[PDB]
């Protein structure tokens, strides 16, 4: 039940000693399914730091201190292993390789595009695959709609304008317009679809009076000629 | 840790990078075609392992260009404030 | 498949027009469409039927 978010909620509510998660087998082990080895850089580790620093006062009501300290031992051991491996890795380098430039370009651009979830070109119907497109657009809409409205730039070209304490520079909004062109272009999609239908179903709906090589064929001219035959008058 | 980069640093550094980026691209296709949103713990672990290697050459070799291309801006928050004229009902 | 279109008529005429030019250059065989319709054993079997009709009618 997200104990690694329950610690964050108890920290941000500023009352963590008053509850202390009721560390028994019935409560502290029901959310764990040891502790699950936190994932973040420090956002789930500083919480463990503060949690141990608050639980130094009771020291016996909470039996889960030992598994947390075992994970501190694991973190210290992994850190010492990485420091020894970084000491050896800087000694295992060849004296000459002369890494190529125009492949370093491609690795940097490819890593940068693979960070922020966009498609990388290689250079090295069916409503199953219709929903898998219409579920990537809701991703982008509900990711752009969580940006703060007070978003603003600071380009490297405001130094040539000498902005005072209150001067209102003229390149402050080169990202918030761009973060609304996407968010409103991804909501006007089923309007340009309905305009493209009215375009194609009135250009292709003639198809034999505008295109020259179709209205000059034998069979099209014969069909258009034969539909215009006025019915025979008996007597 | 590293556990492989010591062994592969003895030869060329660059083959593992492309052989890992192709795996990232295949895993990204397999995440798109599965309606999953969070990345797995198998490519995240495989992501930093890429970014380490490209760091170390820049630490070690000092490759002749290491090109610089930036958008020359970055987003910052700016102060907001309500209007001072009161509301009319 | 009961009806014809402009695409069907154009494809039929283009196919039948390119099959006729490929017999001058002899880059297509077309021996199967020949011999499945000639079929000389069927021809002599039919001639034997005509001969038996001559015998039965005389």
């Amino acid at each position: 039940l997200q104990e690694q978010s329950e610690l964050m909620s108890t920290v941000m509510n500023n009352t963590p000693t008053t509850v202390a998660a009721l560390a028994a087998v019935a409560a502290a082990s029901e959310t764990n399914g040891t502790i699950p080895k936190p994932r973040s850089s420090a956002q789930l580790e500083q919480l463990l730091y503060r949690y141990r620093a608050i639980q130094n006062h009771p020291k016996e009501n909470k039996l889960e201190i030992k598994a947390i300290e075992d994970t501190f031992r694991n973190i210290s051991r992994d850190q010492d292993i990485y420091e020894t491996k970084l000491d050896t890795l800087r000694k295992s380098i060849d004296k000459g390789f002369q890494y190529d430039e125009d492949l370093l370009n491609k690795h940097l651009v490819a890593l940068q595009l693979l960070e922020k979830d966009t498609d990388v070109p290689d250079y090295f119907g069916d409503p199953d695959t219709e929903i898998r497109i219409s579920a990537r657009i809701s991703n982008r809409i509900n990711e752009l709609e969580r940006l703060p409205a007070n978003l603003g730039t600071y380009s490297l070209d405001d130094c040539l304008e000498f902005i005072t304490k209150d001067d209102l520079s003229s390149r402050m909004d080169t990202f918030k317009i761009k973060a609304l062109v996407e968010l409103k272009s991804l909501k006007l999609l089923t309007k340009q679809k309905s305009i493209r239908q009215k375009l194609i179903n009135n250009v292709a709906s003639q198809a034999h009076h505008n295109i020259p090589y179709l209205r000059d064929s034998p069979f099209t001219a014969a069909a258009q000629r034969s539909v215009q035959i006025r019915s025979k008058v008996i007597v | 840790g590293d556990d492989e980069i010591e062994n592969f640093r003895n030869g060329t550094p660059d083959k593992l990078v492309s052989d890992s980026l192709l795996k990232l691209k295949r895993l990204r296709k397999e995440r798109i075609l599965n309606k999953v949103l969070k990345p797995t713990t198998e490519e995240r672990e495989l992501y930093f392992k890429v970014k380490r290697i490209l760091k170390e050459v820049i630490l070690a070799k000092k490759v002749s260009k290491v090109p610089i291309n930036n958008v020359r801006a970055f987003p910052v928050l700016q102060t907001n404030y309500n209007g001072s004229i009161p509301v009319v009902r | 498949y009961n009806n014809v279109t402009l695409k069907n008529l154009t494809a039929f005429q283009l196919l039948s027009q390119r099959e006729n030019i490929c017999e001058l250059l002899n880059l297509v065989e077309s021996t199967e469409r020949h011999n499945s319709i000639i079929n000389p054993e069927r021809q002599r079997m039919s001639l034997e039927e005509m001969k038996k009709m001559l015998d039965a009618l005389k």
Binding site: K106, E115 | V71 | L27
Partner: peptide
Amino acid sequence: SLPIEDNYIREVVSKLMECVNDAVQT
């Protein structure tokens, strides 16, 4: 982990003789 310019991503990214041999003959 600095983003790259968009205008740089957009910047880095036997059938012959079978007729002749039949056209020479006929």
